[PDB]
Structures are given as C-alpha cells and as structure tokens.
Design a protein around this nucleic acid. Structure first.
Ligand SMILES: [Mg+2]
Ligand SMILES: [Mg+2]
Length: 1205
RNA sequence: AAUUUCUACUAAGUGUAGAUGGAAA
C-alpha cells in the first residue's frame, strides 16, 4: 500500500461541464416558426435597463432614508480625534465606538424601512411597478414579470452596500470613513482660518440664495455631519466648498476659491478645502473609442490640465515643509534611492547602518535573527520624510532639487510625446483603417498613455499613506491633481481591452423557453414544472424540451420492440437530506400517520442535537424514528432500495445524514419509441437537441477529453455515488460573431504547411476544407451541466497532518522539486529519501504521447520566436497578450507532466514560495505566470485523475486522489499544502551540491583601506605550483555577515576558468588572470603573500583585484546569448579533491550531481524538502501538527554541508 | 489550422495531445 493509495474520497468538490447542443430533425424550423428566440434575446438586451432602474430605485431609497438619519456618537469622537490620542489604550475605545457606529448607522438600511420587500420577487412585482412614471420604464419591468430570479447574483452584489463589510463598497464605509475625515478636517481648517473670508462679500452671497437658514455658519459646525448624508445636502455642501452657479450667469465663487485668491498677499500659504465622497472608454465602436481618447486626453482635457497643475506645483517644491512631506515606504523607495543618490540600494543601506548603530552593539558578527528583525523593523517603518533623506544623503546633495529635476524631466518627456501626437489630437483628423488592424492610431495612443501612466505611477509615492502634520498647502493641490490624474488608469485599461479584443465575440444570452423554472431540475415527478430530460441511443446522448403547453408528451411512450428504443434518464438523487428530512417528516402530517411522546419530548428539548455529552439512546431515538418513517413513507422506499447498516455502527447524526444522502441516489432508465419521439419532434411538440462535442462524433478515435469522460461516467453502472448530476443545468445561445464575408479557409487539396519543426512530415493535404474559426461563424446552442464530485465523502480528515504522518512512518520518501530557470522554463529533479538524483530533465520539450508514437513539441523555442515577434511589432498590446496566453497555455500542459510524476513515484512536490523571492529579470517564466501555475496546479492536484486508466480503479475517473486542500488565495500559500511544500528560495542556485559551499564575501571595491582589510582577512595566498593553482584559505569568522555558514572555513582555489559580464562577453582563465595581475604589477608570487600585497597602495591594483576575486566566486557562468554554454563551477575541493564542473556530467545518462545550473536549483529545493522530512522524523505523532518548515539560512546550510560529509 | 472553451497543433484525415467551474459583478 503506497502513500497515495490512502488519499481518496476526502471531501466534496464541484465542477461544471459545458456542451454544445446540436438541434436535430425539425426542431430548428420549429423554434424559428414559433419564434422562441427573439423574446429571450430581447429579454437579455434590455436587462441592462432593468439594472439601471434597480440602481435608481436603490439610490432613491438610500436618499430618502438618509434624509431620515441621525448620529449621536460623533460629537465625542470628533473631539477624541483631534485630541492627539497617540494610542496608549485610548484609541481602542475609538476603534470600538467607530465600528459600533458604522454598525448602527447601517442598521437603518439592513434593519428597517422595509428592506424585505426589496430583494425578493416583490421588487419587480410591486415596488418598481409602483415607483414608476414612464410607459417604457414599465414596458421593461412588467415584461420581466415571471422570471424574477434572473437578478440573483445581481441581488447579492447589492448586499455589499447595506452592510459594514469594512470595504469601500459599503454605504457607511464610504459615507463615514471617506466622510468623517474630510468633514472634520475642513471644519478644523475653518475654525483656524474662518477670519479671512469677511462677511460682506462671501458670507452673505452664500447666505441668501442657497438655503435661507443656517446659512453658512451652522454648516461646518459639529453635528451637521447628519445633513451631508443625503445627496442634495452634500451636493450643496460640495458646491459651497468649490463654487456656485445660482441657476444663471452669476457664477458666485466658493470658499476655497476665496482662499485661492487670498494668495495676493503671496504669504497666506493657506491650504485648500476638500469636499466629501459618496458611493453610487468606448469598447463598443471604433470612432467612439477614438472620440473618448481625444476628448479626455487633449490639450483642453482635465487630465492634461491636472498634469500642468501638478507640474506647476512642483515648480514650487523647494519652498514647502522639507520635513513634513513624506514618500510612502515600499517598492518606490528602491528606485527613488536609485535615481536621487545614484545607486539602486542607497537609502536601504543608510537606514540599515543606522538601525545597526542603534539596536546593535559592537558585536563582531551580525546574526540571522537580528537581520530578520531589522528587515521586519524596516518594513514596519511607515514612510520617509524628505528631511530624513536630507540627512541620509551626503553633503551638498539637494534632495528636493534633484526631485524637481527628475520630475520636470518626466513632464518634458510627456510634452515631447504630445508633440509627436498632435496629428491625432487635431479635431480635423480622421481615421483611415480599422482601429484594431491600424497601428499609427494605436502606437501613438500607447506612446502617450504609457508616459502619462508612468508619471502617475511615479508621483503616486508622495503620500506617506494618515500621519501627523504635513504641508496641507502642498498636499491640498497635490491631491486635487491626483484624484483627476487617476482616471488615466481606467482610460488605459479600457482602450487596451479593445485594441486586444478578439475578432469573434462570445456574447451569449441564456434561454428560458417560456418557463421561469426551465431545466431547474431532473426529477421524474416535477419534470412537468422543469420540462427538461435526457435520452440516449447507444453512445449518443440527447436533450429533449417539449413546449409550454404539452408538458406530458414524454410520458405515454413505451419501447414497443420497434427495433429502436430511445432510453431515458430519471430517478433523481436525494435533495438536502439534513434539512429536507425534518420538513418532510415534521410537516404537521402526524394527523393520521402515527398514534409516541418521548420522540416529541427530545425534539422539544432539542437534545438530539449537540449540547449533550453523549447518549446511546437520545440521538438514536430520532434516528430510529426517521428510519422507521422512511420504510413507511411510500414515496421513497418504493424508488430507493433503503438498505441501511446495523445499529452498533452509528455514533452521531451527521453520519446518519451522510448515510441518508448516500442512499438517495438511484438514477435509472425508462424506454421509449423512436418513431414516437420523432413524430413528437415533427409535430413541433418536442424540441430535441443532441449533446455533442468533438468527442461524440464517430470519426474521433483517440483519447477523449476529461470532461467527456466525466459525462459518460454520469450514467455508467459503476458510478455508485462519485459523480452525480447536481441539478440546475442551463442552456445558452451565442450568435454568429463573424460575418460570412470574413471567413478564411485553407482550400481543399492545397498542401498546407506545418508549424512545429520536430514533426518530420512537413506538409499536409486534407481532402476537404479547414474553416478557420468556423465554430464562431454560426449559431451554436451550448448548455452547461453542473456536477459534484464526491458529494458524500468517507475519509474525512485534515490532509496537512496526515501527509506529515505518512512521511514519518515512511522510510523511503520521494521528493519532486520544481524551479524556474534562465534557459529552461521549468526544470524537474526528483530525489530519493537520501539525496540521490533519481531523475532530472528540463521541460522546454513537452512530449505529447499519442497513439504510441511520441511527438515532441518545444515550448521555449516557441516562446523565443513569439518574443522576437513582439520585438518588432510597433505597439505590442496584442503581441503582449499572446505571450501571456501561451505561457498560461504551457502551465496547463506541464500540470500533466507533474501529475504523472506524482503518481509514478508517490512523492511530494517542492514549490518556490514567491512571497520571498528576487528573480533576476531574465528568468523566462515571470512571477505573475508562475503564481498562476501554482493555482493551476493546486486545482488539478485537487482531484488528480488519469484519463488512460481504468475508470473504476484508484487514480481513475471515479477514484481520483484529493491530495491538496481547496485553493484559498494567492497570499494564503505558505509552508505546506497537501503534497506541496511552499519552501523559500534563498541561496538555492549559487551553491555547490558536492560541498555545500557558498560565497558570502562582499567582493566589490569600496576603499584601498577596506581592500587591504579584506585581503588580510584571508589566511594564506600561495601560488602552489604542484597543480599550478592559487590556493586561498579563509575563515568566515574573519569577514562579517557570515552568520549563515557552518563549516566557516574553506580552502579556495583558482581551478579552471570563469565567464565575464563586462554588453560584451569575454572568456577568461583565472590562473593566468592572477599571473598577469601579479606580473603586470610586480609582486613575487611563488610564496602567503598577503603582506606583500598590501605594500601596494594604488587604486589601480586593488580595485582591479577585487573584481577579479569576484570573478573567482561566480559558480553561475553563462553566455547570456546562447543556451549551449551554461556551466556551474565550484572552486572548492570535494572529499576527493577534484572540483565540480557541470560540463563533466552533461555527457552522462544519469549523473549524481545536477547537470545544468537550473537543475541545481530544483536539486537544492528538493533538499530543503528533505530537511523538512527529517525534521518530521524527530517529533511525535501528536506534535507533527506544529513542526515548522521555514528552513532558515543557518539550518539550511547545516543540512547542505553535513549531509554530504 | 477544425475545439464546450484555451493552448500547442495536423496527430494518418470533418481531427490528435493536455487542461477546463460556470453564472453573476
Ligand atoms: Mg482527445
Ligand atoms: Mg490555436
């Protein structure tokens, strides 16, 4: 019994099969002549109108009820706010009061004013019919009367407002947390500067025309937050704050405009006010897109005006609070420090040195826990004041002026891009081609939007995310510009969603066939309400839909031996036993059914539920009553063979309900007459589609598609309970999106060309036609049928624990490690329990295995061709989607080459944990693709099943494994999942496998003094001429930052040659390199010569020497221009003494050490997983559920150096 | 370049190999 063989039938799972429904016979002419489509197609197209109406009524309800709202807890909390609470267990009651407040204010919506006659059928039945004015506004709704469930997901998406889900999609969350901040802040700035706007010019002119009472004064004061919760009140507030129109050409100016003019003194520097928020692009026609672009991005657009305004703001950057202004800490810092100071990692280093000077004493060598806590303290830092950067700099470094410099440079680049694009902004310009094919009207669009969005992405940093005092005179105008510049994001993402849109179109609308309950269930008793059924004639399945008013025309039909009989499918599975059993047995129906009192007593107690320790009679009483009622309730026992188990096996009620649902699935067949249903069809009393995909057609011979297998297995005589038809299928239609004047086709007998070079046959000559995108050039009725794999599971138990358990008790574990690479998309090595490379290879060549003869199809050469294609495509918005699809079509053909190894070896998988990786900008599989892969691997491994195997055995369509829990979220991937271990990826490639050596030195030039310190740090530098190598001895106790290594001492060498970076490319041998660096500078070298070295003092030697020493510790030599020279080398001796040169292994069937540097990566990942298994084999069976797997650098190096001796 | 759909195809000729959870927003 292997490990996998136990994992089976673990927990529920739900998939959804899709199928094309071909209409057959004369049902097409039937649905046409009776016009059963256009009613629905219209029902779908105006459904957007009903959405508009529902939105409008919801907003009216919100408005009038928030005219009927008041708030109490604010008057104390606003004062608590400006108090400078500074935590100290006094803002926790702030959190409590604010959460409770957001609760109670949303208690109007969630609680009262109806809200129940809002989300049932009641809405379009009574309310929207009532609340209505236009004849067409009712022509839509009254038409939708009957199909009220078509808003189901729409209804649920409307719950998000009336709750307190702590997200901007809520009512109180927007109108409270995006309101209280701004309202209180504006009232505060009012109390500060309410003395500049005098009475007789602004106050009275805002007094009279607006409200005639509480004119302007009471507005900002205190509790008036209650009145800004409506829409007209908040709108008049937001007009006061910005300016009014007074319904004529007066244009009376607002308070903030008054303070804006008040810089005539040129020294007010008085910040600007801010209104409140409130909750609730083309892509349809070409010229519409072009118009949107030219109208919302031209020289008179608000986006460009805001760019100009923020540029003018940065014209005054220097004269602001050089210490109250903050950049937000995070990824931006990494490039801001690169551009200001010059080097990519300056600010990080400065703060690292500071926190070392503060929290670290003068101890000789740092430790890994201290470094980790320092990085955590760094991430914990909120932001970085510009003044901290002033001191973080060297002298004479104007951080503010450098910032102004780079930012004005960006903006002038924007201007230049505009100057290139004037031809497209000229209102007298016209388009010439189809925008999709056209490029000049897309290449220019991209050159423009890209620069603009890069500026928006670069300036976004200047927030500091929620702080103390800042230059509100700066941030005011800043945010006023930024909230407008943000829209370029949406405009960009709606132009790109069009220049990439496919030529066909998958717009579909759902059929109903004049039945609100269409195809809702598969039940022989309520078929008449559902009016949907399946047939079968051998190996071809059929769907049958009769009509509205003949619903019984599939009942009185018997086989008759006419040499042809359509079968049938019936005999529903049991619905909701846990809850439909109580309502089917406690439905008042005791009037003339039985005579007992104890059963009723323990139900009135509810003691047969939980809340009792244990009872051998209490719950068993309910159970025996149910089982004696099912034997006498003649509507079930007649159908189902109720064969229960014995009484001693029972221990709970959940097991009982599980057993019931197990005994509630008895699908079977009835017969029918072929000519009978045929005449039913011809008479237009039965519309009968075949269910079909490219497998059911006779001419198919190869292996079917997994979902074909699932469907076929839905009716096999082995599908005991595994794959059951979760009722509620639907039936869609989608029009022909291609015009028949556009179709393209390789004509008959024309010898076509074949794209994959490995395929030897270089042509092909079909004797018919190959219509490119045919399936979209015609109507196509497709239907969806859900299923539910393993509805009644047996082996209920946590998986993460039992994989650990089975690992401990196991003696020989296997481990599959996967890691990316620069010359391989994904490299696989699989190791034994002891550290042997059992198998290694690359996955650049997925080898399809069909009909015995295998054809290999590359996937890296393909990706390189598509990339070189992007390189010369002039706009690459559609040549950058093709690659993001090919990759995501290559991590769906490696899932099989992995769920092959897992079955073949009964192993675990080792995946890099992306949360802690730094991939070097040249790995072929970018992070966003790999992150998808891990999700597309958890999902397959969730129900791993082979297609070429026995549908009955283990590992087949009915008994596939479940060896990994349901995927939760991209970030919830940590440290284990079923048979997948999310292990980090530090020091995983630059490490020799034969020794465990690593290079922890800091081998770049800093200063001749530091150079001499590093040189003397060594132990012995003697050019031993017996092998003619330069042996270097070193103790990692000498150099700092070496808290990782464990051997801590090594005898380096100059063995062999290394490859430069220099971009040029230059092979060099290290021995002769040291020879020349000794002779050319004249140091007698046949001897330790460390002292002889430090005699030199020129920067023209040590600088050139430190780089050569870096060249000594490479271990990752490569061309960067050719895949065929990529070798890993180790300048440290093994037990023998010979070094590790991967070239020695490439010409070997199955080496013992990794062949390519990539393979080294997967090897070291698998070894981390092995260390995890080891740590599993030390604890106790009850303590395996706590063992940590986060193999820190120290422990990892300990393992990777002690396990090899 | 044929597909419930996606990807790579031509895979011995109306198709082959993998994968696929859809509807709503
Ligand atoms: Mg197939
Ligand atoms: Mg294709």
């Amino acid at each position: 019994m292997s490990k996998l063989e136990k994992f089976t039938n673990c927990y529920s799972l739900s998939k959804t099969l899709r199928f094309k429904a071909i209409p057959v016979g004369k049902t097409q002419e039937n649905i046409d002549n009776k016009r059963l489509l256009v009613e629905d197609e219209k029902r779908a197209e105006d459904y957007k109108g009903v959405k508009k109406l529902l939105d409008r009524y919801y907003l009216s309800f919100i408005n009038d009820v928030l005219h009927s709202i008041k708030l109490k807890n604010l008057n104390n909390y606003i004062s608590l706010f400006r108090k400078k609470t500074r935590t100290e267990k006094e803002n926790k009651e702030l959190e409590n009061l604010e959460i409770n407040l957001r609760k109670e204010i949303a208690k109007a919506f969630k609680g009262n004013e109806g809200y129940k006659s809002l989300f049932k059928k009641d809405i379009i039945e009574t309310i929207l019919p009532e609340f209505l004015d236009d004849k067409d506004e009712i022509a839509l709704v009254n038409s939708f009367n009957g199909f009220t469930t078509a808003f189901t997901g729409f209804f649920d998406n409307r719950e998000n407002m009336f709750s307190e889900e702590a997200k901007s999609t809520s009512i109180a969350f927007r109108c409270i947390n995006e309101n209280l901040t701004r309202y209180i802040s504006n009232m505060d700035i009012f109390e500060k500067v309410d003395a500049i706007f005098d009475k007789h010019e602004v106050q009275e002119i805002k007094e009279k025309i607006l409200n005639s009472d509480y004119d302007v004064e009471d507005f900002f004061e205190g509790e008036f937050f209650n009145f800004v919760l409506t829409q007209e009140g908040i709108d008049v507030y937001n007009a006061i704050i910005g300016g009014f129109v007074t319904e004529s050409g007066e244009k009376i100016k607002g308070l903030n405009e008054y303070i804006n003019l008040y810089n005539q003194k040129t020294k007010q520097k008085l910040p600007k006010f801010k209104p409140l928020y409130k909750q609730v692009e083309g892509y349809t026609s070409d010229e519409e897109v072009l118009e949107v672009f030219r109208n919302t991005l031209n020289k008179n657009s608000e986006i460009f005006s805001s760019i100009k305004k923020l540029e003018k703001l940065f014209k005054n950057f220097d004269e602001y609070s050089s210490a109250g202004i903050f950049v937000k800490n995070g990824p931006a810092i990494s490039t801001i420090s690169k551009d200001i100071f010059g080097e990519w990692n300056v600010i990080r280093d400065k703060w690292n040195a500071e926190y070392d000077d503060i929290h670290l004493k003068k101890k000789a060598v740092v430790t890994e826990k201290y470094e980790d806590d320092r990085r955590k303290s760094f991430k914990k830092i909120g932001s970085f004041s510009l003044e901290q950067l002033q001191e973080y700099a060297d002298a004479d470094l104007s951080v503010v002026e450098k910032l102004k410099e780079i930012i004005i440079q960006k903006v002038d680049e924007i201007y230049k891009v505009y100057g290139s694009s004037e031809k497209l902004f000229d209102a007298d310009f016209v388009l010439e081609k189809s925008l999709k094919k056209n490029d000049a009207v897309v290449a220019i669009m991209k050159d423009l939007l890209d620069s603009v969005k890069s500026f928006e992405n670069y300036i976004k940093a200047f927030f500091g995310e929620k702080e103390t005092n800042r230059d509100e005179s700066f941030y005011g105008d800043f945010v006023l510009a930024y909230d407008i510049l943000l829209k370029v994001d949406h405009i960009y993402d709606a132009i790109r969603n069009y220049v990439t849109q496919k030529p066909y179109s998958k717009d579909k609308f759902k059929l109903y066939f004049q039945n609100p309950q269409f195809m809702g269930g598969w039940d022989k008793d309520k078929e008449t309400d559902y009016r949907a059924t399946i047939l079968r004639y051998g190996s071809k399945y059929y769907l049958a839909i009769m009509d509205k008013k003949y619903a019984k025309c599939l009942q009185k039909i018997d086989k008759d031996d006419v040499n042809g009989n359509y079968e049938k499918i019936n005999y529903k599975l049991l619905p909701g036993p846990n809850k439909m059993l109580p309502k089917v047995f406690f439905s008042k129906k005791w009037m003339a059914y039985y005579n007992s009192e104890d059963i009723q007593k323990i139900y009135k107690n509810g003691t047969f539920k939980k809340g009792d320790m244990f009872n051998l009679n209490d719950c068993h009483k309910l159970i025996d009553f149910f089982k004696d009622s099912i034997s006498r309730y003649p509507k079930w026992s007649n159908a189902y063979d109720f064969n229960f188990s014995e009484t001693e096996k029972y221990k709970d009620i959940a097991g009982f309900y599980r057993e019931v649902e197990e005994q509630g699935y008895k699908v079977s067949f009835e017969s029918a007459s072929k000519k009978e249903v045929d005449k039913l069809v011809e008479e237009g009393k039965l519309y009968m589609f075949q269910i079909y995909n490219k497998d059911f057609s006779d001419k198919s011979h190869g292996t079917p598609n997994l979902h074909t297998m699932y469907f076929k297995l839905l009716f096999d005589e082995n599908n005991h309970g595994q794959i059951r038809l979760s009722g509620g299928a639907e039936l869609f239609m989608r029009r022909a999106s291609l015009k028949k004047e556009e179709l393209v086709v390789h004509p008959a007998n024309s010898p076509i060309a074949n794209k994959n070079p490995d395929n030897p046959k270089k042509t092909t000559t079909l004797s018919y036609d190959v219509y490119k995108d045919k399936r979209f050039s015609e109507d196509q009725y497709e239907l969806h049928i859900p299923i539910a794999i393993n509805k009644c599971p047996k082996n209920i138990f946590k998986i993460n624990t039992e994989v650990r358990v089975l690992l401990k008790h196991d003696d020989n574990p296997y481990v599959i490690g996967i890691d990316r690479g620069e010359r391989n998309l994904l490299y696989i090595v699989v190791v034994d329990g002891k550290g042997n490379i059992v198998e290694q290879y690359s996955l650049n060549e997925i080898i399809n295995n069909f009909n015995g003869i295998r054809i290999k199809t590359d996937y890296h050469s393909l990706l390189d061709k598509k990339e070189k294609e992007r390189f010369e495509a002039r706009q690459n918005w559609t040549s950058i989607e093709n690659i993001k699809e090919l990759k995501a079509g290559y991590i769906s053909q490696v899932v099989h080459k992995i769920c092959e190894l897992v079955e073949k070896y009964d192993a675990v998988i080792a995946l890099e944990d992306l949360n802690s990786g730094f991939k070097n900008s040249r790995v072929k599989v970018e992070k966003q693709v790999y992150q998808k892969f891990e999700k597309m691997l958890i999902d397959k491994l969730n129900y791993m099943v082979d297609k070429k195997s026995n549908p009955c055995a283990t590992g087949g369509a009915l008994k596939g494994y479940q060896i990994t829990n349901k995927f939760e979220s991209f970030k919830s991937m940590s440290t284990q999942n079923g048979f997948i271990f999310y292990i980090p990826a530090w020091l995983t490639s630059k490490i020799d496998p034969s020794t465990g050596f690593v290079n922890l030195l800091k081998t770049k030039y800093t200063s001749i003094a530091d150079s001499k310190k590093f040189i003397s740090s060594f132990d012995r530098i003697m050019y031993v001429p017996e092998e003619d190598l330069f042996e270097f001895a070193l103790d990692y106790k000498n150099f700092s930052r070496t808290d990782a290594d464990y051997i801590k001492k090594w005898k380096l060498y100059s063995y062999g040659n290394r490859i430069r970076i220099f971009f040029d490319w230059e092979e060099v041998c290290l021995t002769s390199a040291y020879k020349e660096l000794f002779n050319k500078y004249g140091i007698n070298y046949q001897q330790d010569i460390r002292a002889l070295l430090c005699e030199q003092s020129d920067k023209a030697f040590y600088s050139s020497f430190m780089a050569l020493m870096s060249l000594m510790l490479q271990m990752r030599n490569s061309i960067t221009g050719r895949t065929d020279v990529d070798f890993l080398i180790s300048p440290v001796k093994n037990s023998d003494g010979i070094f590790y040169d991967s070239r020695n292994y490439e010409a070997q069937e199955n080496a013992i050490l990794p062949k390519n540097a990539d393979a080294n990566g997967a090897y070291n990942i698998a070894r981390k997983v092995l260390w995890a298994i080891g740590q599993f084999k030390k604890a106790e069976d009850e303590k395996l559920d706590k063992v940590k797997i986060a193999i820190s650098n120290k422990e990892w190096l300990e393992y990777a150096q002690t396990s090899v001796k």
